[PDB]
Every structure is written in structure tokens, then in C-alpha cells.
């Protein structure tokens, strides 16, 4: 039979609102992650979506139909058992223009991505561009472009759009990114997509000797219906491990941690705890490695792990030396244009005293620019950040026309 292992790779699903991201994740995994009525009432799904699947190959059948997402070869007309390849997970990022920050949060977890482009809409829509550029900046360059909703357009329309997309990727880092036509709704040509995922989004090399670091996704910020969060022994903290590994019974800390407030003075103090259990999907494990949304059981009271006063952005081993900073220095670069805006806009230079939004790991923090000199800024953060490394790229956003727009990026210098 097929093994039960944790997912070994995270694949983002990005693109403009209503282009078919959640439907595509369903076509691949069988799982619809969002709540239909909530989406109806709000006109959007604000949480990240998360789902998993095993991937196999029927070695007798021919490709792409030989690829399967369950232990059967019936889809390619064979009674043989498919060979297990790997388990993968998807991170369904919101496409709505008011939700870039959430997308950026999700993007911190991606090892690769699928950009979903609706065939029946003008390419490229504002969040098509914004998400594409964000992926570029962050370094999620193992990309597949999917032309979705091919069932509603003619061959000529699809061809025309294809030419637009080729023209778009031409002369960029994505010049050789494949473009795969599908219908997510009708599950048309999904096997070619799986084939593409195996070809273009290889599981990255993981150096398990690195210090363990996990980026935290608060439970209120994610729809992960398939992942067990058992509070029997205490609060469960979900997220994704970006380096090293964690093990049951290990001592860990949540950083920046708990908001304290002693005599007008405000600080965030680390929350130490211990791993009581580790879960992926509906299975328990002795250890957890990068890839997948892991559920780390602790011995903490759930009232703490769910608290607004807990700034839980990362988890590390208890021994880890991690600066927690209220004021940071960033060596930045600005985009030329506000790529996510409807109007054609140049991004203005960074000005002292302006408010910026900083995406660091899975966290989002507003800050005031105290100093701007050359290609470095100093910013006083509304809440501190935990800087677990010297090589950390933050994404910079600015409020424009009542929405937060990505305008650039930088290195957090410590």
C-alpha cells in the first residue's frame, strides 16, 4: 500500500479573484476548502486555503494520464497499483485586491506556485500581475501558469490569450514557464497539470542540520479542514516549517510572544513550551520537517494560543538566539510601477514619517519610517518582529487608494 507521510512540498495557488484557484485545488485534491455561504455574504474568502494529496504514477499506462492523485490506476484503464511518488500540499492564496497581505503571508510558505489565469478575462488582470511579481520578488520561481475555464472559450480565444501570456513572460525570469490549459470545474486536463507539477516543481533540497524554524499561521487565518487540531493536552499551533526539523518532547518557544505591559512600558516576552504532539492531516508523527501545514501540539492553555495578545509569528527551539526588534533597518528596492493598481502609477520614493506595511515571514506589521538614506530605511514597528536570520527578505507595501499595494522589497539588516 501507499505510505502515510507528511507532505514534502508546498505549492501556492495564486491569481486574480474568481479565476478558479479554490476550484483548481478541489480538482486536484478533491477538497473544497472554503465555506460557500461565508464567501457569498462577504464577496470573498479572507483565510488562506489548505489541502493535501498523494501523487502517484501508473508505470504501465502512458502520460499524462498515468499520473494519479489516489492509489488507483482506473483513470488510465489499468488494474495495477500505482507507484507512490510524493505527498504534496497546496496553499490557496486570496486574489481579492484588498487581501495582498494575506497572499504575502501565504507566499512565505510556498516552495513553488501555480498562477491561475481565467481564459475568459483580459490578461493580465491587476492581481495576476501583482501575484506574479510578488512570486518573483520572494523567489518562488518554480512556476506553472494554468489557463483555466477553457470550457467557456473557443480555440481561437484561448490561442489569443496564450499569445498574450507568452508575450508577458517573454524577457522575464518566467520566459520558459509552461502554460497548461485546464478546466478546474470540469476536471479537464488535470493529469497534464500533475505531470507539470512533477516536472517543474521538484521537492527542494532540505538541509536538516539547520536550526529549526517554523512560520506560524494562526488558526483563524486558515481553512485546513483536513488537518487534525486536537487540544486534549493543550493548545495546538499550526504553521509550516521552513528549515530544519522539530521532534516530540522538544522544548520550543513562540516568538515574539506574549504582550506584557508593566507600568506603561510595553514588551513582548517569549512563550516557552514543549511539543506534546505533531500532526499532519489526520496522522500523528514523531517528527516534522519542511513542507505541509503542521499542527504542533503544546501544553499551553488554548486561551493563550488563540489570544490576540499572543504575537505568535515563529516557533524555534528553546535554545535559539533570535533578535526581537521594534526598530529595524531595511536595505530596500522599489518597484517602478504600482503593479497591482488599476491606474498606471509610478511608486513614489519612500518618505520619512510615512506608514509602511512590512511582510516578514508569515507576519504582517505596520511601521513608521523614521529615517530614509540612500537605499536604506529605518522603521519603528507598531509591534516587534522576530528576525531568525540575517538574510531575510521583507516585502514592502503602501496604502494607495484605500488598499495596501505591494511597492517593493528589502533585506532586514541586523
Ligand X SMILES: Nc1nc2c(ncn2[C@@H]2O[C@H](COP(=O)(O)OP(=O)(O)O)[C@@H](O)[C@H]2O)c(=O)[nH]1
Of the candidates 86, 322, 293, 357, which has an alpha carbon nearest to the alpha carbon of residue 202?
A: 86
**Interatomic CA distance for residues 63 and 65, integer angstroms:** 5
Q: Which of 4, 29, 5 is nearest to 288 (CA)?
A: 5
Residue 30 assigned to a binding site: no
Q: Which is nearer to ligand X, 153 or 381 (CB)?
A: 153
Closest contact distance (angstroms) between CB of 52 and ligand X is 18
Beta partners for 91? 12, 50
Residue 61 annotated as lining a ligand binding site:
yes
d(CA 382, CA 327): 9
| Residue that the C-alpha cell 513542507 belongs to | 291
22 is an interface residue for ligand X by CB under 6 A: yes
Q: Which residue has the cell 495582498?
A: 100
Q: Among 55, 135, 177, 184, indicate the residue that binds ligand X (CB under 6 A).
A: 184
Between 22 and 316, name the residue whose CB sits nearer to Mg ion.
Answer: 22
- Look at residue 191 and give the partner it binds from Mg ion, ligand X, Na ion, none, a contact being a CB closer than 5 to 8 Å depending on partner kind: Na ion
The closest of 85, 93, 91 to 54, measured between CA atoms, is 85
Rounded to 5 degrees, what angle do the CA atoms 307, 105, 21 make? Answer: 115
What string marks each residue from 12 to 51 as x (binds Na ion by CB under 5 A) or -?
----------------------------------------
Binding to ligand X in span 93-112, by CB under 6 A? 95
Which member of 8, 72, 75, 376 binds Na ion (CB under 5 A)?
75
Q: Are 87 and 5 in contact (CB under 8 A)?
A: yes
148 marked as part of a ligand binding site? yes
Among residues 6, 10, 11, 20, the one that binds ligand X under rule CB under 6 A? 20
Cβ of residue 64: shortest distance to ligand X, in angstroms? 17
- What is the smallest separation between the CB atom of 346 and ligand X, expressed in angstroms? 29
Candidate residues 11, 17, 386, 387; the one interacting with ligand X per rule CB under 6 A: 17
Q: Are strands 83-92 and 112-118 parallel, antiparallel or unpaired?
A: unpaired
Q: For residue 215, is it left (φ>0), alpha (ψ between -120 and 50) or beta?
A: beta
> Is 74 a known ligand-binding residue?
no
Considering beta carbons, is residue 95 or 106 the nearer one to ligand X?
95
Type and span of the H or E element at 67: strand 67-68
Contact flag: residue 22 with Mg ion (CB under 5 A):
yes
Can residue 203 be called a binding residue for ligand X (CB under 6 A)? no
* Identified binder of Na ion from the candidate list 114, 150, 222, 385, rule CB under 5 A: 150
8 in contact with ligand X (CB under 6 A): no
DSSP assignment of 263-329? TTB--EEEEEEE--EEEETTEE-SEE-SSS-EEEE-SS-HHHHT-TTEEEEEEEETT----EEEEEE
Stretch that binds ligand X, among 101-109, 144-152, 163-171, 202-210 (CB under 6 A): 144-152
Could you tell me the CA-to-CA distances from 108 to 235, 291, 390 in Å, in that order? Answer: 23, 12, 16
State the cell numbers at 76. 488510465
Which stretch of DSSP H or E encloses residue 89? strand 83-92
Among 65, 81, 121, 151, binds ligand X (CB under 6 A): 151
Cβ neighbours around 297 below 10 Å, total? 24
β-pair partners for 373: 376
98 is in the binding site of which of Na ion, ligand X, Mg ion, none (Cβ under 5 to 8 A by kind)? Answer: none
State the binding site for GTP.
Answer: 18-23, 148-151, 183-185
Summarize as ranges the residues that interact with Mg ion (CB under 5 A).
21-22
Summarize as ranges the residues that interact with Na ion (CB under 5 A).
53, 65, 68-70, 75, 150, 191
Summarize as ranges the residues that interact with ligand X (CB under 6 A).
17-23, 95, 148-149, 151-152, 183-186
State the binding site.
Answer: 18-23, 43, 45, 58, 61, 73, 76, 148-151, 183-185
Amino acid at each position: 500500500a501507499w505510505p502515510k507521510v507528511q507532505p514534502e512540498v508546498n505549492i501556492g495557488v495564486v491569481g486574480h479573484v474568481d479565476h478558479g484557484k479554490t476550484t483548481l485545488v478541489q480538482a486536484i485534491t478533491g477538497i473544497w476548502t472554503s465555506k460557500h455561504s461565508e464567501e457569498l455574504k462577504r464577496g470573498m474568502t479572507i483565510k488562506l486555503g489548505y489541502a493535501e494529496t498523494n501523487i502517484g504514477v501508473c508505470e504501465s499506462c502512458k502520460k499524462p494520464e498515468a499520473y494519479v492523485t489516489e492509489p488507483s490506476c482506473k483513470s488510465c484503464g489499468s488494474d495495477d497499483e500505482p507507484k507512490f511518488l510524493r505527498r504534496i500540499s497546496f496553499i490557496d492564496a486570496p486574489g481579492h485586491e484588498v487581501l495582498m497581505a494575506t497572499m504575502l503571508s501565504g507566499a512565505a510558505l510556498m516552495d513553488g506556485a501555480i498562477l491561475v489565469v481565467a481564459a475568459n478575462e483580459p490578461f493580465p488582470q491587476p492581481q495576476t500581475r501583482e501575484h506574479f511579481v510578488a512570486l518573483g520578488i520572494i523567489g518562488v520561481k518554480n512556476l506553472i501558469i494554468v489557463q483555466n475555464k477553457v470550457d467557456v472559450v473557443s480555440k481561437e480565444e484561448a490561442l489569443s490569450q496564450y499569445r498574450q501570456i507568452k508575450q508577458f513572460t517573454k524577457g522575464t525570469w518566467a520566459e520558459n514557464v509552461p502554460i497548461i490549459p485546464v478546466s478546474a470545474l470540469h476536471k479537464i486536463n488535470i493529469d497534464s497539470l500533475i505531470e507539470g507539477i512533477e516536472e517543474y516543481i521538484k521537492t527542494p533540497y532540505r538541509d536538516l542540520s539547520q536550526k529549526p524554524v517554523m512560520l506560524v499561521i494562526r488558526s483563524a487565518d486558515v481553512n485546513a479542514p483536513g488537518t487534525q487540531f486536537n487540544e486534549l493536552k493543550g493548545g495546538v499551533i499550526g504553521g509550516s516549517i521552513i528549515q530544519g526539523l522539530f521532534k516530540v518532547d522538544q522544548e520550543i518557544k513562540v516568538l515574539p510572544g506574549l504582550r506584557v505591559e508593566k507600568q506603561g512600558k510595553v514588551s513582548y516576552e517569549p512563550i516557552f513550551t514543549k511539543i506534546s504532539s505533531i500532526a499532519f492531516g489526520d496522522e500523528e508523527f514523531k517528527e516534522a520537517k519542511p513542507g505541509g501545514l503542521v499542527a504542533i501540539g503544546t501544553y499551553l492553555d488554548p486561551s493563550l494560543t488563540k489570544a490576540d495578545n499572543l504575537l505568535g509569528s515563529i516557533i524555534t527551539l528553546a535554545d535559539a538566539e533570535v533578535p526581537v526588534l521594534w526598530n529595524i533597518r531595511i536595505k530596500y528596492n522599489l518597484l517602478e510601477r504600482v503593479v497591482g493598481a488599476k491606474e498606471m502609477l509610478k511608486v513614489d520614493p519612500i518618505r520619512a514619517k510615512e506608514t509602511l506595511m512590512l511582510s516578514v515571514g508569515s507576519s504582517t506589521t505596520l511601521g513608521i519610517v523614521t529615517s530614509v538614506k540612500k537605499d536604506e530605511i529605518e522603521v519603528e514597528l507598531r509591534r516587534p518582529v522576530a528576525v531568525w536570520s540575517n538574510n531575510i527578505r521583507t516585502v514592502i507595501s503602501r496604502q494607495i487608494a484605500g488598499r495596501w499595494r505591494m511597492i517593493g522589497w528589502g533585506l532586514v539588516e541586523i
